[PDB]
Design a protein around this ligand. Structure first.
Ligand code: NDP
Ligand code: NDP
Ligand code: NDP
Ligand code: NDP
Ligand code: 6J6
Ligand code: 6J6
Ligand code: 6J6
Ligand code: 6J6
Lengths: 254, 257, 266, 265
């Protein structure tokens, strides 16, 4: 029988690679997107042409704001993301919190949008998603649960060496790290594993020559393959961990 | 000549110990409070009686919500206003201690309650500290270099034990994680203005069971056992220290179940 | 043509499981052992049965002491372990530093004990891996570039729980700390040769039941995920993954395999 | 009556400043040295002039080798360093493991080999272990009514060893070991109220023997102050962790690095 993965920010780049890698392992994939509707749908078309009934796409803004229909809260929109898996395939085995906004929030020379957007997508939405994922599992009768529940948070290998001017983003990745550890401890009784993967420089649009390994940013596969392994039954003893995929970049000093 | 400290959640417990310790070094202290008006004002009375015009108190809800006034007033404005209060009253703000921290369960395993918890926990512990630091920094940057103080220090109160999370406290644990990130990012970016940014993480302090589990002394800390560390990190002897965290937990993070 | 793995302490438990997992991927394996000669030979028969000439065994004390021949240093014993791979199969692609001694060295209450403990605990957990990495790297550097393999990888078996020290095990915990510094230092310095160096740190894995059963049950019950120790495979599969081409951007890291044990507090 | 501090590598640089700082708080100081006899002796002269019988000097090689006789072990040499405090003043309250060897051991290219491992691992990790063990033994053997009331051990570790200096593998491993000792000793020695902490400099009193451009180069990399630290900028932190105000702190490391560890290449 066929497991289901929910992948946020799945339309392009690492999220796409993650969805493709999970698809190749036999997963049906729910492809979340925000603005990249055409890329999400083209992705879904490729994958459904490969195996019918193996991809859907769902839209949501994961910023921490109310949207239009009572206003719709982020919590609700997160619970509905997970509900789309259960509605279409009756299960949700893997969650990958990949979607992320990333832009400067300088301390030294509006703010309310940056805060909602950078914290929502990077931290608050992952928490609501993990909470909805777990409620669904706890509400499944023990005999009917899957046997390999796995949540991956995409964190950042370099946030201990902060990028100058990216405070809110760096704070939100730090919160997402605390989510990995607290969610791994609390959800262990349900056998839901929760882990982090931290890219260094991946698929850049010249820090890249500073990467000790190969002196380049990584490909998308070089990160997504790690995510796929941590979701595999071979990784069943791994929880509350964080795997850097950074080519040694976090080893460098100015 | 007299430096000024702003201490959030200053009315009781570690915040009061911190404001007392800074006061003892000669600081004037702005005592921020939320609901503890009576406790804050009693503290300010004591300090003012000891040294006239050495304490004020200022009220603010550091939850990430709008509050009642034109338009409603955002967290950002209330945070700027706290820093402004020190500049208004005393012409300076040398030290900021981000101590205010709302703490209660947010279980993942079983909502008006969760919008509230998110705003309150993610606010007091992480978002308000960010806007406070930004307002602190704006001020210094806007002060002519010749008139700047010589010892700017920001202290974030974090948690020695959040790498070993307390079961059921996810949002609070996330918010302390964000606050650790703020310490390292602000330390790097504010270094050109010589503004130092460090963390102090208590383990168990002034508990109101696990106390027996602390390797050193088998008890929680007193308030001064934490606040003395804060005061050291704000002293000129600590001027090469930035971007770092000091645990004050009597070895509790060393323990495994 | 067939890649080669050296696995120290490979006779039993996790080192055996590592050697088997690498053999299953198609590596030829040099199984190092110290006193478990019968177990190493047994395992070597099994692998050589699945696939002829794909396992050998080599004996070495990896304690930081000179042995009987002029006297033989630890360094020389480590260079010879790596040489054995090259002599027999013309290459060494993978090194797994797994061999480890582990016993109490209390700070609080014969100096023979104290002496030999330091040499044995540091040698096997830290100094031999240093020399082994040095020898592995000198060989790769000494290979004409055209003839180099395309996936060199060193795994160092660390401990997920050494930041929460086991009471009474100071020297062991210090040695594991040196071994984490070796991972980071060797990763940085060997990056130009495309040699990845990563850590795997098992928490409670194949716990020997050699005390009252309440103590074995009590230990296991503390692990958040499954309330048990791991199987050997649950660790060795991570080792295998990190040596595979799909891990080729991963270096200088440490993967904990601990069921969330390091998330706990007393 | 007067508390006693044992400082290793006390003769120059940070160890000298730690010794002076502790002395300035009223400590008697046992000044350990290996080659810098003239410096150690001058320091003891200064401290003894300031306060009679407040300093002594003791010489020991802290490399993990046996020395000139039956050979003397690094273990015995460390117990005797502790015993000198007890023989002269009857106590030892503070131990600062400051002595340190630091030089390349490249992975990529005879008695230079074996001597490097012994010297780098000895000074930075194994001698700190035997010193802590001796220090602990002496406290456990003291009747509780005669115990000091503020025992503190400080290990000098390195803020930057997680971003390893290229070519310095043995050194970086030795400091990793010493961080392990901080955490395991703090756990084990907590029942005797002996606190065990680390202080990690980044770039402190950077030595002058390179071209000025290269010296200014290194310094300019530190976010805070674009300079290396003074010796007192590190030693003040050491002294604060030894003070009774720090009595709830154990098993922790304090970085004194001007934010150098927050950088990336
Ligand atoms: N690539 C790199 O070098 C690094 C990546 N990372 C982390 O790895 C993960 C993936 O990286 P990468 O593939 O580069 O990610 P991208 O920066 O390409 O962003 C991923 C997706 O996030 C979605 N997203 C952004 N904001 C929101 C929002 N408010 N609501 C909903 N979705 C949103 C976007 O979806 P849409 O396009 O549909 O609008 C976007 O495609 C991220 O979590 C990132 O933080 C960390 C360090 C370095
Ligand atoms: N005590 C301990 O053992 C531990 C403490 N810590 C940290 O140390 C610091 C001090 O601890 P402790 O003294 O026990 O702190 P408290 O738990 O007593 O909290 C301090 C003050 O924070 C203020 N506060 C709470 N919510 C808000 C809000 N929404 N807006 C404004 N202010 C608010 C309250 O002010 P008022 O009373 O005026 O409403 C409260 O008095 C905190 O940052 C805490 O997280 C970390 C781990 C353990
Ligand atoms: N199992 C666990 O719970 C944990 C394991 N680890 C680490 O994982 C690795 C594997 O664990 P595990 O399988 O339990 O290991 P073991 O304790 O079973 O020991 C591994 C092997 O190391 C070899 N060894 C010991 N001392 C020496 C020496 N002086 N010279 C050469 N070889 C030596 C022994 O070989 P021989 O039998 O041939 O003498 C032994 O079989 C080790 O590095 C360990 O420290 C870390 C934390 C927990
Ligand atoms: N300065 C810096 O920027 C940094 C310093 N540190 C750490 O801080 C501490 C103090 O630093 P610093 O003042 O620079 O230290 P030094 O490099 O100046 O060394 C201090 C003393 O160690 C002694 N020593 C060296 N080898 C041996 C040995 N085999 N046995 C006995 N003693 C020995 C020497 O004593 P003698 O002269 O008497 O021979 C030397 O003066 C050290 O632990 C260092 O590792 C860490 C990172 C950066
Ligand atoms: O593509 C990037 C590079 C960008 C980056 C660029 C340069 C760096 O040195 C560095 O650490 C990170 O990091 C990201 C963080 C979030 C995200 O969604 C995308 C990226
Ligand atoms: O008083 C406490 C104890 C409480 C606590 C209690 C028990 C623990 O094991 C632990 O880690 C933490 O932590 C706090 C966190 C924030 C705060 O504002 C107050 C406290
Ligand atoms: O087999 C074990 C379990 C043992 C162990 C692991 C975790 C514990 O809490 C504990 O009490 C004991 O740790 C080891 C360390 C090194 C080693 O080579 C083997 C082991
Ligand atoms: O003097 C130094 C500076 C030196 C140093 C520190 C930071 C650097 O970037 C660098 O290149 C060199 O580190 C040391 C380590 C041990 C020691 O005993 C002394 C020193």
């Amino acid at each position: 029988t066929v497991p289901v993965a929910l992948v946020t920010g799945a339309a392009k780049r690492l999220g796409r690679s993650i969805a493709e890698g999970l698809h190749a392992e036999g997963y049906a994939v729910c492809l979340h997107y925000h603005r990249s509707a055409a890329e999400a749908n083209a992705l879904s078309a490729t994958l459904n042409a490969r195996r019918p009934n193996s991809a859907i796409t769902v839209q949501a803004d994961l910023s921490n704001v109310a949207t239009a229909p009572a206003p719709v809260t982020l919590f609700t929109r997160c619970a509905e993301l997970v509900a789309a898996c259960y509605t279409h395939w009756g299960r949700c085995d893997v969650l990958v919190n990949n979607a992320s906004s990333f832009y400067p929030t300088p301390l030294l020379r509006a703010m309310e949008t940056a805060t909602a957007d950078l914290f929502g997508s990077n931290a608050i939405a992952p928490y609501f998603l993990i909470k909805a994922f777990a409620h669904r599992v706890a509400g499944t009768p023990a005999k009917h649960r899957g046997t390999n529940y796995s949540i991956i948070n995409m964190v950042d290998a370099m946030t201990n060496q902060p990028l100058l001017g990216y405070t809110i983003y760096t704070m939100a990745k730090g919160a997402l790290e605390g989510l990995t550890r607290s969610a791994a401890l609390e959800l262990a009784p349900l056998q839901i594993r929760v882990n982090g993967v931290g890219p260094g420089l991946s698929v850049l649009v010249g820090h890249r020559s500073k990467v000790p390994l190969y002196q380049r940013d990584s490909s998308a596969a070089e990160v997504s393959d790690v995510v796929i392994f941590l979701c595999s039954s071979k990784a069943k003893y791994i929880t509350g961990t964080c795997v850097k995929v950074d080519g040694g970049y976090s080893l460098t000093r100015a």
